[model samples]
Target chain A: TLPTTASSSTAVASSQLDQLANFAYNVTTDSVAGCTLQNLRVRRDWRAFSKTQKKDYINSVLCLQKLPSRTPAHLAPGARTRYDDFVATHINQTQIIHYTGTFLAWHRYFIYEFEQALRDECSYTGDYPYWNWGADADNMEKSQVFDGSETSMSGNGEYIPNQGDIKLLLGNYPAIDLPPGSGGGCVTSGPFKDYKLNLGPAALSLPGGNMTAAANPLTYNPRCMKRSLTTEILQRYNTFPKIVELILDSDDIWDFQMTMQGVPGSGSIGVHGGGHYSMGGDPGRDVYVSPGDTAFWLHHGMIDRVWWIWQNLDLRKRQNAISGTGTFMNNPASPNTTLDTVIDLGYANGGPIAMRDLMSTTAGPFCYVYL
Target chain B: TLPTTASSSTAVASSQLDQLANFAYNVTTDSVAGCTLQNLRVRRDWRAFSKTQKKDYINSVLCLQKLPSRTPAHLAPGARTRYDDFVATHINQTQIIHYTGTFLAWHRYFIYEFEQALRDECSYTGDYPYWNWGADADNMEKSQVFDGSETSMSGNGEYIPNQGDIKLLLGNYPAIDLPPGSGGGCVTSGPFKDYKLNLGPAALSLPGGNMTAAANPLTYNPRCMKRSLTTEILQRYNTFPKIVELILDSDDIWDFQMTMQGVPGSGSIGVHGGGHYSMGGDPGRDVYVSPGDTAFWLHHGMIDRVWWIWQNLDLRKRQNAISGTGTFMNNPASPNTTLDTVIDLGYANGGPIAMRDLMSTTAGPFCYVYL
Candidate 1:
């Protein structure tokens, strides 16, 4: 009757609004007080989860889609649920928060926040899980986090043959190509098969390095979720050795994060492409609005895990390092970002958390360890 | 005309809502990617501020009071402004957030959140400043952060000459008596002369161990702001050397925070009571709603500064250390908090930030260094 007015905003089914309350708590007190390595929460690989646990996580996600939006309807007409509210934020801040000094930390915080949402909103007690791109680099169709089973994040989109490499050309960076996944159509199984997305793409995958400056990303254009897992992309760039080398090779924070993003002309899209390209779809392949694809959280979770593992290797030396300008690649010639430079999320979380507070997986606002 | 629906919510003159957008960015980014010691933000002492700078800081606090409330009118009828929203959070989570293993970290995150609000909601560019209690311990009537000048947080409350020693008896802690400050009445100067608080108190101050289990704390009980700078308490418990000793003496995190709180039964009330009791008044003295006073932000800012400096002294060993149970003094018998255990701030902040995420001031979700 209300035409997508988030009718289910208040309909949490026996569960109360206390879930939002729980999500909000993590914002201020990011981690527990006595965060010893001994008791650090171990975030495990998605394959380790039992069927019910996996389903519970999926249910939590669906619950988020039904929760009331934090974004005002006027700001983004399509943001009707708490889940879309996140996409709204990423869509708005993508240009500035990414391709710059804030990328790694920004993403690290994002997946953490999303994980908390699942815990607080749907009472999913398990940690926001991760999918190792390398583990299923060649056999993505059966991966626990992405396989089409009832427990998967969902299977690949039904195959759409004749798909080509996703090409990208932006700013001063050299043009690049990303090999397409096996399937490239609507998600056909698991939890979000019929899921509808409100926020659409700003930066999408294309062969000629084509990216349209969409007149408006906030317009309400509802569409189904789609994803085609690109194993070819992951196999080449995101192997176990590559991650290890990225960690072992980079001694400084600057090199560490950039290397993780991958070098420009190396014929390798790096892990960013490997992990993100693997989840090909209208939204999933759309870099800016990737969060719209639910697995992006798990994908980004692994990204953060990579960063965390790197920092953990040399806590003292790596803990306080950073580099790059505020603007993406300094396109606008902005000031270089510093530890004290603010990382603004614009109403997604609480107020300004200092930079010094978020550098460590065991410090600041995070307390989990990868097992 | 609206009596108090926060007409100023969208009324930031010249400045726009982008400030909130700016504040929101910090929550997601926390700090800059390259948080080296060289670029760390130095939070200065209030006494060093020029009149204009000090006034700018106070103006930011007022701007926050004018910003609209995030708390729904249904939940907290009195939470008319963003300023009150924080007080509302502190009121709701007092029992769990304070006097436990999470005490230091909780307040650390609280003051950080408030400072961010000042920056984002009010277009505040300066750091959330701090008050040096030791510097003004004996001269409460004329301290820079508290003196009732055009730039003061405001001097001690108008003296109520016959005020007796304030006493407290609660939890399992022994009965304690606090000497009254020079003043014990309504604030008489600087900013917030006519400030009003809506969220009332649950825990209050009294000698005969008095505390009311108020039926509802969210009722719209509007009243004046009050503060009394108790120099006698601060002079004994909050000197610079005392802080220095606290940092230099403690090697472990447990003993460090506990010492900062002070051992019970000893004549000392610890710096907690010393800093809080000194601001004697309706809300400040009330303990639970102490944030009702604008000065609470600066006061707690100094508290965080102290903890930050302590951690900086020995970064590695102390980075991930913490102690205490989840409940206030373990009243309800919470399991001992681990690094992975959650540090929930209820709805005040974001959701489910792990304890391991908030260990160091220089890492995780924080940036900035205290000078």
Candidate 2:
């Protein structure tokens, strides 16, 4: 049984996790040839980044960012162009969607991918990141952003954003500017546009004690949004397990989403947010931003990464979406899919073929779907 | 580690525990013959009497009725002949003081004895009595007593008597009429005279749920003192290791007391009547009743019972307190004394048996000092 009090394993030295987090952040932000794209673009030469750079890159994506687009753009025509323009173009094409389901799975996945990105880019090896908020009794007060009662963001004279940000971000983009096709404006989907993060490791550390505090007191910041791609990377390490736990055990999926979105929605919307769009980002319908925006593919990339981790952790426990008919769909992207035959994206083993073949991750003779 | 949320095992079936609680009350008030005498002069048999007779009994006492000189002829030689005579004769005898503490101990014992009486009198063979107040979260207002609150006594109220009754009975005793030598004045002994009780079990259960809740509600109304004793009898039928498993382990012992006594000092008082000394009876010094009234014996008795179960389940782990000077007996009752020798109370297990021995109920030759 999970203890109500904080877990003993959660006792990692605060300094360690904080340092790891900062290192991961630097990896994601720093510019490196053949390693990181200036904006939110994927690494062009993932095999050559240094070990440290690789680990940091993965950590940054996994631990912090959210992704807005789901279309995998594997080196597009003339994609070998300068890294800056490539990243900018990707950012301008992503879309944001409002979902209503568990968002943790996506957020977890986002972080996982970030970790994976580092692994693939720099051959870095490290465990994925996790948010530990229970370190303090008052963590809720410090971490909460729009907790339905008061504002948690701190600053002498900083303006806290409200629903208005959503209105502006959602309506400003054109159809071409957004991801192709309409998963529809109302429907939920994978990969989101941006992330509005609440408390992170730094915020959770104890004040002056180096332990996770409830919030970042100095900044008066209540929450933050990880780039969508970062969410994907983290998800590779953490998201899938959480999703399966939610689906199989019938846990409170909505509450989990609220934790991911940072902006807790009313009942049903919260539930939908967790299942599809995370941090208020839509995978197929929102305009994406490059690294400068950080809200674009950073989150979704993280989610994708976690999916890989989950597949590797246990093949039998892959994403099996419960259909409306109370059945499961094998294809994860299918409107309604279960665990029977979803594409196996695990990289440890080998494969590359059809949808089911997609389940395994290996560069082989297979049709690559790109928009 | 104990789970934060209520585990399935910890979830008390309210109806069942209630049956046990009611049964305990019935046994204590109706079946236990000598209990009332050891504490309240009112006997359980008195409940069967007519209103007039009841009134007459109360009227006869010098303190209750202020009657003078009237005396009954059939009383024991040294015993006061009649209600008025007993009052007059025992007035200087520290009426309540000499008996209050004994009564508290007796009552604690009474509860257990009553449970036993029920088993022998009725066919109840289940574990000790329990009060499952958590069963009614909806009608919380009515169940406020056991809701676990600092301001209310509903939670632990079931375990201990109202301290206010103790104070009122003590303060209002008709000490003015008693003769010399007896003083008839309320006896103040140990810390009992001016000691105050914290929010007892009831109050502990008011705010939080389970262990985090003020006290451990699992052992809340564990079958009365009698039930523990009776359970011990059944344990004789079990195998060694199985019995040992049932025994109270070291961790269990530590956890149980932590719940029983929220803090050291007078904070261990029963929760009833705003934690005042009125609800629960006083624990002044005396024979049978002195050691019986505080419910300390009762609480510890349960601890002992748990320990007993643990012994049968695991004997090697049982720890007995032998060195009383530094540890268990921080402040010995006397200058040269320690909890080591005196607390053992000569069960013949060995010379100054360790704290572990006394903790285990099955460590035979164990005899109740009062019973």
Candidate 3:
């Protein structure tokens, strides 16, 4: 219903990405006298930038593409028997290296990158969008109803009468490098096999690193420059890891039926590894697509935004992000990111941003633009 | 604390009030053809005028009172409770008049005069201000707390030792004048005596003009306005037969002592009474005084603004005010006093005022310089 700019390529200018990276890095490393990246001043700086810079950056990002279509529903009613069955069947299925972990981490980064692009390209100042799982809590099936280009499919042993009995199906997925420890786990048939793995209570409860849980593949780590221990690795991965896993495994099992599957490209390494695109998924496959793909970037960007919104709506969550020990996404290292770190990112050369910095688009020099 | 201008007796300049009244009347009563004075429009018009005119016409209405003090706790917790309670109690209670029939008809004219003053005073061209209740609901109590006005008294309600009780004590007693059957259930004596009248459910079911039950004292009956009902009798008796009887009889009962109590005042009649306020509390006293002392005219004017906020926040409420049934201040004798009347008022001499006119104060003339 709204107007769109040119309909050609949706890729953001590389210059924009570089600017965003520089902005992100400067903010992450900069330290104020007697203050850390977590300081309110630091966070406020980013908020100011959002009021000024973020608005234009986001507009630029959206201008790169036509208006987004509404998302299609993804999961069917109930536990989605098909998806559950697939998880059970393939969760322990043997392989040299399980790509799910890497896929999860890489996509997290991919989405963060896209969000940064919005900051850089669109001049998007408001807190990035957030995934509203609560919006989908009543009917996970509605996930399929989103505007993304991906098609949802039933996996595992779950039954979906409408889509028909599809043992497996192909769908769109981002092709990004995986984080360390993403491959083979104790769950695999190996010397470490039988080692109990805890996926944690939910995606938010996943462990910080390998010492926490080796068998568990998914981590609650979210890509956040201001939050500690979010494993820059997790931020690199995009979207919900579980959804990506379903798409990858489904494609692998139904490779013959669908033209594209997990891990894209014609080359072997392209099929399984690279700095930016690791995780054994094909570069040409649905899960291994480049971040430049509008769909890949936006979905991840939205995921980041959803995280932002979550942080915004709940002050406790924000405090937790600032105080690392509170949750999965807290900074693990010294002089870790804080609300101040996020805020500082707003200054031209100001470094370090904080959770407080990402609040309102009108708070400072930055603002967000979305159509 | 805020400043007060009461020493100056800043009655809004008479010319300003006249201009405001004329302008407001034109827009609210003569704007659109075929527009009925439905529940939604009446209430909406009331609110829009209140918000826009409060500040514009403050000189005449809202007395220049000291601003409430704010402390650390106010800043810390976000004084949400105090602000919210004031809105819900002090504001919403006045709006109940908008829910009835006879009162609505005359109140429409009453608003016309007030809006006229606003239109002239502020050169208001836009529609009235809105309450945005839904938006405010998210954290009313919290807002009060943030403002430093909320305490355990607001939430837990355990009466404080010396601190003022949260319960509204003075405003809940039934009216001194009994309307026929309303006296059968009086408590006879004690603090509860004046409040103990038990008219039964039938009291709640009474028709518009029945003197046996309470009515909106704010309204002066059509008969009183006519030659049949002498102005002397109206002033001497300070009652307009059924309407006045009903309003005085039941308008001041306490529903939730800890929260709020109803204020009593003759509607349009109060406006007509002008500045001649009786100092006593009996036959010589003004028919109603709960706190709507003449000053209430201005207080309610602001209250009206809050109502608009509530109305504009949702489509249902908005539509209900403009065109819906049984949802606005009552005035069954003049069905045209519903949305139709407001549409008429908006037209002035000719043409129609757009819906946008009611949404903002910047668009046109308004009053209430004290807000």
RMSD for each of the candidates: 22.7, 28.2, 27.0
lDDT of 1 by residue, B135-194 (tens): 676666767777777887666677777666776543223457777667667889878778
Interface RMSD of each: 25.9, 32.0, 32.2
lDDT of 2 by residue, B1-371 (tens): 21112213323332332233344333334433323323322122222334454333222221211212233333212222122222222222222111121212222333344334333434444333211112222332232222223222212222222211111111111211110111112322221222222111211111111101112211212111100011111122221221122222234433333322221223222111111111122221111112222323223334333332222222344234222111111110111122232221121012323332343222322322111
lDDT of each: 0.67, 0.25, 0.24
- Model 2 C-alpha lDDT per residue in residues A1-371, reported as the tens digit of each score: 11112112333333333333344334334423222333233321222344554345444444323323222334222112122222333332211111222122222332334444545544455333322222211222222220111121110111222311112111112111111111112212212122233212221111111222222211222232321111221232223233333222332323333333322122221112232222222221122222222223333433333333333333344432221111111000112122232221222112212233233222122111110
Off by over 4 Å in 3: A1-9, A13-18, A32-371, B1-321, B324-371
Best by lDDT: 1
Candidate 3: TM-score of chain A is 0.25
Clash count per candidate? 56, 189, 223
Clashes of 1: 56
Give the interface-residue alpha carbon RMSD of model 3: 32.2
* Complex DockQ per candidate: 0.01, 0.00, 0.01
TM-scores vs. true structure, each candidate: 0.46, 0.21, 0.19
Error of 3 at A306 (Å): 11
What tens-digit string does per-residue lDDT give for candidate 3 at B88-144? 221222322332321322232334444454445335443433222222123322321
Q: What is the lDDT of residue A151 in candidate 2?
A: 20
Docking class of 3: incorrect
lDDT of 1: 0.67
